[PDB]
């Protein structure tokens, strides 16, 4: 104690703080310790400690295989109250620890437009799951992990080594059936000790495997969580801080016109964390790359995740970039002061090159200043204060590109319009996220823009939704604008709108409709073919643009499930999963006949796990079940019976006392049919279809 070298203190501090976290879950926080230790080791030892705690429970449930342990720990973490995990949530939510976790691939910020909106409880659960997977893999390969016994200088150490031995038996329960340990003394773990040498026979370099069995690593500590001494030694030591710092340091169906449905189109978006509007941007680049917009600043109104901002910046770089999106500090996680930062732009190439100081393509380092002083009304463009502040900071006649993507005149749209009119450099470009379906609004917008813009081009993105009549306006600020003011343009636009025909010629409307019907049909056939055939490589240039922009397939971190090479093994996996995790459900159901809420949450967790199993292994499904899963998801629900049938569940799962009695089988079939079907929100549907696209693209 206290005599180990400095190189050994940091992993020991990580082990001790991980033990503290695990005891906490099974204002208090651990940022002080985690900022001065190995955060990846912290989560690895957290997984190790949680595995030690759950070893006996998983052994008495006859869990087999690494994935069985992973599913059990996932549901255990998902079933704890959110107040209990707030200790780990607070540590992860800290900006330094958050960036550390992101950079060590432990944490990926997904499904949140802003960092402050991230589900840090789910984020902590994901980190602990990653640590558990790392521990299981390292144990399987033979990397033994030290067990610490604080407050011991007995029998509890013999129990702890028994927990580790039972974990090891559980890992290889497929090859050989583990013996019973129920109702047995902590000393009689020698039976398990003996059978692990038998299991070791059935595979390479066994020396490390056997060493962790016969000679378990153990380290008893007379003091108790000891961690404070290690933390003080690390902080005081100069090298220690030096060591910590060193450790942590093609779709061409788009067309241009120069002047309540399932989100199936997201499958064609197989890249990107959170929003993926760069896909709608790709078609814009094909027309705006010819002209010059790099000079001058760029302004992005309501950009949100900043995906379009990133992909515009990589190929069209600006000197100053003024992000702007709606955000209030009220939705921050406790004890955090997160600014509105686009969680997709921060991990992209432009911000990664800004932070490390490398120059951009133009040779001028991009200066990224979000428009945020602390007022929620300031982020909301409908307020006049927002307009005045935005115009103040960017400066009138300072920028050349303005990207307005405000979703569907409303006060915010006209406010965004005269922000641009005031701030664009003469000859500057505006890209606008219009909408053709309310044609009156379209005529109004076209007239007001035409008063002071020239070369107004209407472009429908080939990657946009085929049902929303979306149009991306491509217009240039007219040189030498002699327009009196914005209000005259607006009032006069009202006149034309209420006194005469719309400025759009009927021939252009007919052309738009004629190209729109064929484009929608073609895109729908492309989506249908991609979902059905599941060809791995389709439209490589578009996704290559995303990869150059800094986008990566986010299915790796959201879908950590394995990729079975056979469909029979897939079905067998849920045959184990359902039969293992419905035991509690049946137990409480028989006990009561409060509990119904637990029943429902366990059922929902099981069905969601089955859903992600299906999505991860979507490619290897036969086309018939692929088709029926697509049909089920289209109405917005995930029926469990399509993937696997109750007779298959009974056949492909080990025989047990559960699922053995006529009443038990009857209630299993009752809970097995439509009564366990779950519903999916629209954002959930986009998540699922994007994940399917990612799986197809990567497999």
Residue numbers in the entry: 1434 to 1459, 1478 to 1604, 1609 to 1657, 1663 to 1685, 1688 to 1711, 1736 to 1745, 1772 to 1920, 1929 to 2113, ...
According to the publication:
L and P function as the RNA polymerase complex, responsible for replicating and transcribing the viral genome. To catalyze the RNA synthesis in both replication and transcription, L sequentially consists of five domains: the RNA-dependent RNA polymerase domain (RdRp), polyribonucleotidyl transferase domain (PRNTase), connector domain (CD), methyltransferase domain (MTase), and C-terminal domain (CTD). P harbors an oligomerization domain (POD) for self-oligomerization, and the oligomeric P attaches to RdRp of L, tethering the polymerase to NC to extract the RNA strand for both replication and transcription. Here, we resolved two L–P complex conformations from the mumps virus (MuV), a typical member of nsNSVs, via cryogenic-electron microscopy.
RdRp-PRNTase is quite conserved in structure amongst nsNSVs, while CD-MTase-CTD resembles an appendage of RdRp-PRNTase with great structural diversity. In MuV Lintegral–P, the appendage is also less resolved compared with the body. Different from the conserved RdRp-PRNTase, CD-MTase-CTD of MuV Lintegral–P adopts a spatial organization distinct from those of PIV-5, though their individual structures are pretty similar. The detailed alignment showed that MTase and CTD in MuV Lintegral–P appears as an integral on the PRNTase side instead of the RdRp side compared with PIV-5 L. The overall spatial organization of CD-MTase-CTD in MuV Lintegral–P is surprisingly similar to VSIV L. VSIV CD-MTase-CTD is highly flexible unless unphosphorylated P locks their configuration, while in MuV, no P fragment is resolved around the appendage. In MuV Lintegral–P, an α-helix hinge termed Hinge-1 (L1416–1431) connecting PRNTase and CD has been visualized. It is supposed to provide flexibility to CD positioning via loops flanking it. Compared with PIV-5, the spatial organization of MuV CD-MTase-CTD renders the helices α53 (L1439–1458) and α57 (L1535–1544) of CD rotating upward and leaves more space for RNA to access MTase. Actually, MuV Lintegral–P forms a continuous positively-charged tunnel from the GDN to the K-D-K-E motifs, ideal for the RNA synthesis followed by 5’ capping and methylation, which is favorable as the transcription state.
